[PDB]
Design a binder for this molecule. Structure first.
Ligand SMILES: Nc1ncnc2c1ncn2[C@@H]1O[C@H](COP(=O)(O)OP(=O)(O)OP(=O)(O)O)[C@@H](O)[C@H]1O
Ligand SMILES: Nc1ncnc2c1ncn2[C@@H]1O[C@H](COP(=O)(O)OP(=O)(O)OP(=O)(O)O)[C@@H](O)[C@H]1O
Lengths: 208, 181, 159, 594, 597
């Protein structure tokens, strides 16, 4: 009747959670529903000019009548009932790109957040300045630590010190620091532990 | 910001708190260890015990210059007396090594081919005792009162496995009890 | 929390009527709505409209078919019941019911229900056209966490 | 007995509070039956125990009734019947139970059989289509020595006590008790009971599409016989029970089941998804809306919520469905008081649309699909020997059609042999048959609804409007209304259609079925000289205009012209044949003919 | 003897491969959710089990349940009384001697069959635990009857000190098992010389019954024992199979694992499904792009509305293919049969169209009239396929008029009048009046008199014969590669493993995608089709005034909305869009023009 579109708005919001949270980490966030929220932005516009008429007649017509007081409440309540949903969908939108912002917060060519969902990379381009304001803020949290602690990844605890790792789908020469490992195509390694953490999350090495 | 496994531990770090406990070895080798919790010794003498932490001894076993002694309850003639005190006592579990399940799984990777005849006997004498614990746990939760339980002897693993559901059932029923008045 | 589980659960309907006659209509001409006229109400406004007056405005009638013709069915066998096609949630709708009502009669009887449903669920957790799945689906979230704990705990424990 | 009898006696003090509300009921039902039988110049022994009085405060006694229902029910009877005499013994038949309530998940659809609850309480629903015979049965006969004047006593046990597998008595009647007296038997003091089996099919909508309907059977007793017409949504509840010797009564016994499924049950109920009791409220509101002088038009538009227009068709269906009366002639043949409308139309114009939803609100009027095997109105002498010596004329399709409606399709796509059958049942209310047995005139009050299609496509306008189907005029003369559905193409007409189908892929019905079934119980006026004066003038001008134009009409068409207005006053719920009814009757035929 | 029992209770609590301890790790998992059943696995069971089967081959009919008494005694170890007995399920696979070597060396040995199950009987009951009363002396005992030699393994004796045969079967303390007598039929491909196929019979236990529908491929493993019914010469008996375990193929009731749907969702996000199927459905069909798209939407369908009133819509589509001989309308139809979940193939001559839908006959027992047969009731949920819609005039049209458009038949023959459900989907491929003349004359002369069938089907293709000199030579280049050399069987296997989809993958995901999602079209499309129709009717309306008659009526307009709902089942999106629907009319706008020319 009134907040009806918000019900099906938060209904399709439920699908975005179960798509991501059940399958894997790979998000591919669907879309922003500007078309849908423009409808409720239209209804909130019509509802707001509805009450200022009765704000205009409350001194002249019914004279702050008890009926009119309840007539203010339905117009008051239907505002905030709509207001509850439209930010909740807004929060659950932005509370999943942070997870995209955390796991690849800068490990190998950070500002290439391109080659990534071009149909929605203009969508979240308005949110990129929000996104990069995480990224700028996450840089000084990396430097504002008084000692060098990694905050980029390595969440699973380490077990051993020698791990057989193979490679595929990659080429070139990388790893200028910690000794160059000279990555040729399709050739396994047998190395120590701490080096490959910045490359497995990078997604160049494949199997543990 | 993990957002994945927050309300409990993942099963890869529950071994991480138990690996930092010490046991006894039989050393072989002759500065050495300055590892801020060290007790480095001199030229170490064989045929003697020493309280050494676990995780360095597993690393000391890959290069294969030491040997491990099992703890004193890891014989088959000892575990049998545990199964009788429980089969006569359906109320609770009796006597618990407190970290036994995760201790065996580390102990079955080049820490099994050292001991005197444990194959086809020890995995027999353990996997029976896992379920006898969890058969006991199924009768216990049916007897759930409000806001008061009696778990006396549980391994750390079942505590990581009873955990993520036992909260929100009694929590959701905590509402309807309390919001009724 | 912005509560994405139950903000839709208060989006459901609820049949009640009036005590006064008010010209405030939004449902479509004939702006005076006559009293004692049964109206489908969404839960959010109807929750506080039964509060604001002494005498409030909405006649809160109980939907006693969600009281008497299901209290019997749950006082027999809490194993396989239609907990779902009568009400797409049975939990927060029972919560926000009892807050205005404050009666310990049914507040005892769903407290028997949940542990019985839980008694199935734990020992159902170790490892078909329209109506049936959502018996198996209202329970899902409550144990979707739980068996996913058991799933990995084997996969560390074996090789 | 002390163990098997103790929780009987502890229940024998327990359930006496579980009839605090029925100990009044069980004696009030007999005290007038004892009274009226003494002043003639009638009810069985039904003691409905609810669940509620046996679940709120007994749990060990509870689940015995739903796990082992074999050590508990003859306890409950024996402790019942003493209360019949302890309440009533001064004036000078065991009172068995019914047990209504819910059950908590025992709605076994009999496509499924159980592995869990065999020999337990079962709730079954479905349809019955067997309806076997009725036959009495002895339980106790009393003998009497005519010499020395002394009596005797004998009870026969059978597979009818429902619970205890006693040693049977393989005997019919004994003679010569231990004396030299020729035994005499008093048959007035020998008691009887009946015995009737009925097979129940599956409700063929909720059984999923992988099988034909299955069936089981049920033995009931006298208290609810002749309650089960074939074609009723019944719902029975009883005990699950096996009987018969499987594996020993013959030798070698290879591949022969010897465990027949039976239900020895109680208390059927018709359901509806005849008994609809309404309060003072809704009975007053329906009079309050009767005061409006528009509600004949509102009911027309509130019937088929999918289709545009056809308000001449839409009023006709509700006029037919409610029904016009037939006043039988005293010592004379009654006339046709049935109404029988017909349709025809070029295809895909909703001719079969409205034909299937009349069956949902049918009020016990189950129709066929018009598949025209011989059996549409007959028996075909199917007896199946009925247990070696009983021949039965099994009811084909008219025991369901009585005071109801039917519908059949595809008239021209039929053989000859059905058309001779529809001749008889229209000129005469009854069929009478003697196939290999008995001549029997059984009565039938039917009303067909037709659906056929023209032959040569869209050839109706360029040829004669008559003979357009050329099925025999034996039926066209016996029918009245031949609505010819047009399908003309207008750009505002189809545009209006296009959204209305589209708007529905995403004044009420149960009030409507109450209104007509209340209007079958109101009195019939038939009597006003004013309304009969105008209609005959209304006939005579078209009696000048039938013969020089389209279609000749006959004298029986006048018996329509009373009958439509007669039912039209039944919509009004009044006893005065007004004037206004005669205007819609004339105007409806004017579209039907022009 | 006994003690075998000690050789197995000391065998199944410890058999494992390398540190997984499997059979306790599933029996524990199987006593919890109530099933009470086992399986066996590989070789050492075979390795020493033949060393037990070298003492079990002598009678694998009485010491097969000597397994069964054992596992109950290990069951109570995992409990601490309501404890049933268990059942066994086996596995073995080397080959399939179909129906040949069946009396010489195969009495009571383990056999494996491949068949098509056709006929199910109603359930029954035999007992497994009884209680027995002597008559006048009142002895009480209890006998269990586990495995069979059909009835009468043992009898009831005369010893209670009371009279002869004093024993009776109470029904107070009894358990029961159910049997089937479902009938098995030979798969009709393995032994062709000139013969007709034969048939056997079999029974089963309850925790493996009701697991088959008629019309499927199946395989089965069990015993070949012999019963003797006394309702023919010397004392001869009959054959039957006692089955053990159906390790079948898929059901072809929506429970399955999770890694199946993982790849499906990984494929369904790649938005190339609509074009990649048309190459990958029929690997043996040159092109025919308009026809090929009509088949994938036919296989899945739309939905079904039981909307809050009385009536209903019909959610299905039904196509036709009429055209010249030699345009592959025939052999395309065998191709839909194997890929369907449920399919029949009755494509010829109608086959007594009154006996297509229903049959009743007298009965050997009790002389009764019950319902047995049908072509439609077998084929629900799926698709039938018939042909020759010229030279059947008898009953074929009067049998499909009711069977279509409402899908609700009721037989009014001598017994019952029951409205059994139907949700079928038809398909036909006829010939016009020798093809060319119907494309060289006035566009009439298709069906002999009536067009009323043609209004009942929506989609109609009218193929023809061109003479394009470059498209034939490719076809003449095409079919020699597929006839001999079988090089495209090596080519299409090379583009299979990264780009195309084989036959066994298409079947499994269609039953998954149909039985999960439930589409609906968006109200923004409501303006789109309404503006479409008013000129479509007008394009017809301008044609009638030129004295051109025939057929379009409104079933097609409510058929396009099912067509646009069809690809929404393909993409598994809960809405429908405009690039969705504009491609849909692009199939039907193409088939509106050929309805005129
Ligand atoms: N005149 C109409 N007005 C509105 N909708 C119609 C009309 N005719 C058909 N329809 C739509 O078409 C669908 C099916 O029509 P239906 O199959 O009943 O035609 P029919 O009466 O069976 O014709 P026939 O018996 O010749 O096949 C219905 O869902 C209905 O909505
Ligand atoms: N478009 C096509 N692509 C591939 N093969 C085709 C095509 N059309 C026909 N064929 C081939 O024709 C061969 C034999 O088919 P057949 O000659 O039986 O068709 P048909 O049944 O005569 O056609 P119709 O059904 O029109 O009579 C098949 O092996 C098939 O591969």
């Amino acid at each position: 009747m009134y907040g009806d579109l918000g019900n099906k708005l938060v209904l399709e919001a439920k699908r975005t959670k179960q798509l991501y949270a059940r399958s894997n980490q790979d998000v591919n966030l669907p879309m922003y529903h500007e078309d849908i929220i423009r409808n409720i932005l239209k209804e909130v516009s019509n509802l707001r000019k509805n009450t200022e008429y009765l704000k205009e007649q409350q001194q002249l017509g019914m004279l702050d009548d008890k009926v009119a007081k309840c007539q203010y409440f339905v117009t008051l309540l239907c505002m905030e009932r709509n207001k509850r949903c439209l930010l909740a969908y807004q929060r659950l939108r932005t509370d999943i790109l942070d997870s995209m912002a955390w796991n690849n917060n800068g490990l190998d060519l950070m500002s290439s957040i391109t080659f990534s969902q071009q149909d929605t990379n203009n969508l979240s381009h308005q949110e990129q300045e929000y996104l990069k304001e995480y990224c700028d803020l996450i840089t000084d949290l990396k430097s504002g630590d008084l000692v060098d602690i990694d905050l980029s990844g390595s969440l699973v605890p380490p077990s051993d010190v020698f791990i057989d790792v193979r490679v595929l789908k990659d080429a070139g020469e990388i790893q200028t620091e910690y000794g160059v490992f000279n990555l040729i195509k399709d050739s396994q390694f047998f190395v120590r532990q701490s080096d490959v953490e910045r490359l497995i999350q990078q997604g160049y090495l494949q199997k543990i | 910001l993990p957002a994945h496994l927050q309300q409990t531990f993942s099963p890869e770090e529950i071994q991480f708190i138990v690996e930092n406990e010490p046991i006894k070895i039989f050393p072989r080798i002759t500065w050495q260890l300055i590892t801020t919790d060290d007790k480095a010794l001199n030229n170490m003498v064989a045929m003697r015990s020493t309280e050494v932490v676990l995780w360095i001894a597993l690393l000391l076993k890959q290069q294969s210059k030491c040997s491990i002694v099992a703890p004193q309850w890891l014989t088959t003639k000892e575990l049998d007396r545990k199964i009788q005190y429980e089969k006569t006592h359906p109320d609770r579990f009796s006597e618990l090594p407190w970290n036994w399940l995760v201790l065996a799984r580390i102990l079955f990777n080049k820490a099994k081919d050292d001991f005197h005849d444990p194959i086809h006997e020890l995995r027999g004498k353990i996997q029976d005792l896992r379920e006898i614990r969890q058969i006991k746990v199924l009768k216990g939760l049916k007897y759930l009162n409000e806001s008061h339980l009696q778990l006396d002897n549980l391994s750390l693993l079942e505590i990581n496995e009873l955990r993520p559901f036992i909260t929100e059932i009694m929590d959701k029923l905590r509402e309807i009890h309390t919001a009724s008045l | 929390y912005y509560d994405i589980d139950d903000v839709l659960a208060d989006g459901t309907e609820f049949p009640c009527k009036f005590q006064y006659d008010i010209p405030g209509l939004g449902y479509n001409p004939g702006r005076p709505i006559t009293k004692n006229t049964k109206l489908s109400l969404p839960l959010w406004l109807a929750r506080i409209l039964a509060i604001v007056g002494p005498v409030p405005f909405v006649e809160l009638l109980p939907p006693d078919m969600f009281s008497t013709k299901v209290m019997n069915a749950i006082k027999t066998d809490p194993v396989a019941l239609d907990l779902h096609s009568i009400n797409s949630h049975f939990f927060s709708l029972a919560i926000k019911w009892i807050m205005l009502f404050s009666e310990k009669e049914l507040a005892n009887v769903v407290s028997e229900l949940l542990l019985q449903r839980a008694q199935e669920l734990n020992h159902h957790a170790s490892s078909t056209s329209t109506f049936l799945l959502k018996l198996e689906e209202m329970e899902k979230e409550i144990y979707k966490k739980s068996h996913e704990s058991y799933k990995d705990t084997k996969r560390w424990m074996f090789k | 007995p002390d163990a098997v009898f103790g929780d009987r006696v502890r229940r024998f003090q327990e359930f006496l509070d579980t009839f605090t509300s029925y100990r009044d009921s069980v004696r009030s039902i007999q005290v007038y039956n004892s009274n009226n039988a003494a002043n003639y110049n009638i009810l069985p022994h039904r003691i409905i125990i609810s669940l509620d009085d046996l679940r709120e405060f007994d749990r060990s006694f509870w689940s015995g009734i739903l796990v082992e229902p074999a050590y508990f029910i003859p306890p409950a009877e024996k402790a019942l019947t003493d209360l019949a005499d302890s309440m009533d013994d001064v004036p000078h038949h065991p009172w068995k139970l019914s047990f209504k309530g819910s059950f908590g998940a025992h709605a076994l659809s009999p496509r499924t059989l159980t592995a869990q609850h065999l020999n337990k309480l079962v709730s079954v629903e479905g349809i019955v289509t067997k309806t076997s015979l009725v036959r009495p049965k002895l339980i106790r006969s009393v003998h009497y020595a005519a010499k020395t004047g002394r009596f005797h006593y004998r009870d026969y046990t059978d597979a009818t006590t429902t619970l205890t597998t006693r040693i049977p008595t393989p005997a019919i009647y004994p003679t010569e008790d231990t004396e030299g007296n020729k035994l005499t038997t008093e048959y007035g003091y020998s008691t009887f009971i009946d015995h009737q089996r009925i097979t129940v099919q599956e409700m063929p909508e909720m059984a999923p599409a992988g099988q034909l309907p299955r069936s089981i059977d049920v033995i009931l007793d006298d208290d609810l016989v002749d309650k089960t017409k074939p074609g009723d949504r019944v719902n029975v509840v009883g005990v699950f029970k096996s009987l018969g010797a499987g594996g020993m009564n013959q030798s070698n016994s290879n591949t022969l089941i010897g465990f027949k499924t039976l239900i020895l049950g109680n208390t059927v109920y018709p359901l509806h998804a005849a008994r609809q009791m309404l309060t003072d409220f809704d009975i007053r509101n329906i009079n309050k809306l009767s005061k409006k002088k528009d509600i004949f038009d509102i009911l027309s538009q509130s019937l088929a919520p999918s289709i545009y227009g056809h308000d001449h068709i839409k009023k006709a269906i509700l006029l037919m469905l409610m029904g016009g009366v037939e006043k039988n002639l005293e010592n004379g043949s009654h006339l046709r008081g049935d109404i029988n409308i017909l349709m025809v139309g070029d295809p895909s114009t909703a001719k079969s649309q409205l034909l299937r939803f009349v069956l949902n609100t049918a009020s016990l009027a189950i129709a066929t699909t018009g598949r025209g095997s011989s059996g549409v109105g007959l028996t075909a002498a199917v007896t199946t020997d009925r247990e070696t010596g009983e021949r039965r004329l099994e009811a084909g399709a008219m025991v369901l059609a009585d005071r109801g409606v039917v519908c059949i399709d595809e008239f021209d796509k039929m053989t000859d042999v059905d058309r001779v059958a529809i001749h008889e049942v229209m000129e005469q209310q009854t069929v009478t048959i003697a196939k290999a047995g008995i001549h029997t005139t059984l009565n039938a009050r039917c009303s067909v609804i037709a659906a056929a299609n023209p032959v040569f496509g869209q050839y109706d306008v360029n040829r004669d409007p008559h003979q357009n189907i050329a099925l025999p005029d034996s039926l066209l003369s016996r029918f009245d209304l031949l609505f010819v559905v047009t399908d003309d193409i207008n750009e505002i007409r189809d545009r209006s259609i296009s959204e209305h189908v589209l708007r529905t892929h995403r004044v009420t019905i149960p009030f409507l079925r109450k209104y007509v079934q209340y209007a079958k119980e109101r009195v019939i006026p038939q009597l006003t000289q004013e309304a009969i004066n105008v209609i005959v003038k209304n006939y005579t001008d078209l009696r000048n205009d039938d013969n020089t134009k389209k279609s000749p009409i006959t004298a029986r068409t006048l018996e329509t012209l009373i009958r439509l207005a007669t039912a039209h006053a039944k919509v009004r719920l009044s006893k005065t044949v007004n004037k206004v009814d005669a205007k819609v009757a004339a105007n409806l035929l004017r579209f039907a003919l022009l | 003897n006994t003690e075998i029992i000690k050789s197995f209770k000391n065998f199944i609590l410890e058999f494992r491969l390398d540190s997984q301890f499997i059979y306790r790790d599933q029996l524990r998992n199987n006593i919890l959710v109530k099933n009470y059943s086992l399986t066996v696995n590989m070789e050492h069971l075979i390795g020493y089990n033949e060393d037990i089967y070298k003492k079990l081959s002598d009678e694998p009919s009485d010491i097969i349940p000597l397994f069964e008494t054992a596992i109950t005694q290990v069951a109570k170890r995992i409990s601490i009384n309501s404890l049933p007995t268990f059942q066994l399920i086996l596995n073995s696979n080397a080959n399939q001697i179909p129906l040949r070597d069946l009396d010489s060396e195969h009495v009571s040995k383990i056999v494996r069959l491949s068949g098509i199950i056709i006929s199910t009987s109603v359930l029954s009951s035999r007992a497994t635990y009884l209680s027995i009363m002597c008559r006048n002396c009142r002895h009480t005992t209890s006998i269990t009857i586990n495995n069979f030699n059909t009835g009468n393994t043992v009898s009831l004796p005369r010893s209670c000190n009371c009279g002869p045969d004093p024993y009776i079967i109470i029904h107070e303390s009894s358990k029961f098992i159910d049997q089937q007598f479902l009938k098995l039929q030979e798969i009709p491909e393995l032994v062709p010389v000139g013969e007709m196929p034969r048939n056997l019979t079999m029974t089963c236990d309850r925790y493996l019954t009701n697991k088959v529908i008629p019309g499927t491929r199946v395989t089965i493993v069990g015993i070949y024992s012999i019963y003797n019914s006394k309702n023919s010469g010397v004392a001869i008996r009959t054959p039957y199979i006692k089955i053990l375990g159906i390790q079948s193929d898929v059901e072809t009731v929506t429970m399955f694992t999770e890694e199946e749907e993982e790849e499906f969702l990984q494929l369904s996000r790649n938005p190339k499904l609509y074009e990649i199927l048309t190459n990958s459905i029929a690997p043996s069909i040159f092109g025919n792009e308009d026809i090929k798209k009509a088949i994938v939407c036919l296989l899945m369908g739309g939905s079904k509305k039981i909307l809050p009133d009385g009536m209903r819509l019909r959610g299905d589509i039904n196509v036709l293919l009429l055209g010249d001989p030699g345009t592959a309308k025939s052999q395309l139809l065998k191709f839909v049969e194997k890929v369907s979940p449920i399919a029949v193939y009755t494509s010829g001559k109608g086959s007594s169209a009154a006996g297509l839908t229903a049959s009743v006959q007298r009965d050997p027992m009790t002389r009764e009239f019950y319902l047995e047969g049908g072509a439609m009731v077998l084929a629900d949920g799926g698709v039938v396929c018939i042909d020759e819609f010229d030279k059947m005039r008898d009953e074929d049209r009067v049998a499909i008029h009711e069977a279509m458009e409402q899908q609700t038949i009721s037989i009014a023959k001598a017994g019952i009048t029951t409205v059994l459900n139907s949700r079928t989907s038809v398909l036909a491929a006829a010939n016009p009046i020798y093809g060319r003349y119907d494309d060289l004359k006035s566009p009439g002369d298709n069906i002999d008199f009536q067009t009323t069938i043609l209004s009942r089907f929506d989609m109609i293709f009218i193929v023809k014969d061109d003479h394009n000199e470059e498209r034939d030579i490719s076809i003449a280049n095409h079919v020699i590669n597929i006839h001999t050399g079988n090089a495209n069987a090596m080519q299409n296997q090379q583009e299979e493993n990264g780009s195309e989809i084989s036959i066994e993958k298409m079947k499994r995901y269609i039953t998954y995608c149909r039985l999960k999602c439930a589409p609906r079209l968006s109200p923004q499309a409501a303006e789109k089709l309404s503006s479409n129709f008013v000129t479509i009717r007008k394009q017809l309306l301008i044609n009638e005034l030129e004295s051109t008659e025939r057929p379009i009526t409104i079933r097609q307009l409510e058929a396009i909305i099912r067509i646009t709902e069809s690809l929404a089942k393909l993409e598994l999106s809960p809405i429908a869009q405009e690039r969705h629907v504009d491609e849909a009319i692009r199939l039907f706008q193409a088939s509106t023009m050929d309805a005129a020319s």
